[PDB]
């Protein structure tokens, strides 16, 4: 067997004194084979599920279709394109529906999950197009999720102007969780760290970058335990939230040490003093939110017709690990 893809890349996190990582086969690919798009539901490679968890096809005027994934080139492809119908959408800031032409996209989520102690990563080739490129964690019941990457792509074609400019969108990594509380309720809690709750620099950027979507990038979490998470950017730390205490580079390169008053994974006790502990599926999508789209952040004709091969969201691979004790000389 030839060496994966990611051999000779250091795992970034360190898995404890006297613990080494250990692959976990189930939820790591490197897609070196071919798998044509495909209209059918189907588990690639026995791994990945071409599309959303339900037959829900996706949010704003995107319409997932199991047809917009592939694997091909090495890496699996998440398609953007467009075939001119429309879709009508709620815009969730105030309940009301609109029509745009629809973006056919693409939605990836495992068969298999994670728990903590679990390092996670992918190496991504984000879209150079004006969408979301999404790389997250959830649990089965929704209560539990953790957002490895939440990027919204490129500039796009020449022309923009106003709400429809994407460069503050384009140049930051969202590096966040969420735990939600009474999902049976309408109004249910949803708690993420963010500036408004009291938890700085969830919104990664780095001076002089516009954005993510001219080359590889890597991005991972360490999922370490329930109250410990570190963020990784291309085999770099860049964020820890543990316990009531949270360290992130800020823009400038400087090192941010902070304390709240609180406990920044679980600030209003959802989690009944468990912290995350849920097991989660890996989920890799693209789509076109309300919010988004209705400000014109959203694929232009030009854009999409003009230049397809950039409208995908690649991904070279991803790896998962555990740790383990070390074994010996053998
Ligand atoms: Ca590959």
């Given at each position: 067997m030839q060496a994966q893809d990611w051999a000779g890349i250091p795992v970034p996190a360190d898995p404890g004194n006297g613990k080494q990582w250990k692959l976990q086969a189930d939820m790591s690919d490197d897609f070196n084979y071919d798998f044509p798009a495909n209209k059918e539901e189907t588990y690639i490679a026995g791994?990945?599920?071409?599309?959303?968890?339900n037959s829900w096809d996706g949010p704003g005027p995107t319409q997932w279709r199991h047809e917009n994934v592939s694997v091909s080139n090495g890496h699996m492809n998440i398609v953007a394109s467009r075939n001119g119908n429309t879709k009508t959408f709620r815009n969730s800031h105030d309940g009301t529906y609109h029509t745009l032409p629809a973006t056919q996209m693409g939605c990836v989520v495992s068969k298999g999950h994670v728990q903590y102690p679990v390092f996670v990563e992918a190496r991504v080739k984000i879209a150079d197009a004006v969408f979301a490129n999404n790389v997250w964690m959830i649990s089965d019941?929704?209560?539990?999720?953790?957002?490895?990457?939440?990027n919204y792509g490129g500039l796009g074609d020449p022309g923009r102007t106003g709400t429809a400019?994407?460069?503050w969108f384009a140049?930051?990594?969202?590096?966040?969780?969420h735990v939600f509380n009474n999902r049976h309720l309408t109004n249910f809690d949803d708690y993420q760290p963010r500036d408004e709750e009291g938890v700085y620099g969830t919104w990664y950027y780095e001076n002089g970058r516009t954005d993510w979507a001219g080359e590889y990038s890597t991005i991972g979490v360490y999922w370490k335990d329930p109250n410990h998470l570190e963020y990784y950017i291309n085999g770099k730390w860049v964020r820890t939230l543990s316990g009531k205490n949270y360290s992130?580079?800020?823009?400038?390169?400087?090192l941010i040490e902070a304390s709240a008053d609180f406990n920044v994974l679980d600030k209003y006790n959802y989690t009944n003093g468990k912290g995350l502990t849920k097991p989660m599926k890996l989920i890799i999508n693209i789509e076109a939110q309300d919010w988004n789209a209705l400000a014109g952040r959203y694929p232009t004709d030009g854009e999409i017709y003009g230049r397809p091969e950039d409208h995908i969201m690649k991904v070279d691979w991803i790896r998962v690990y555990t740790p383990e004790v070390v074994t010996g000389h053998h």
């Open positions: 791994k990945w599920k071409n599309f959303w968890h019941d929704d209560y539990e999720e953790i957002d490895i990457c939440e400019m994407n460069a140049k930051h990594i969202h590096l966040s969780h992130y580079l800020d823009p400038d390169g400087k």
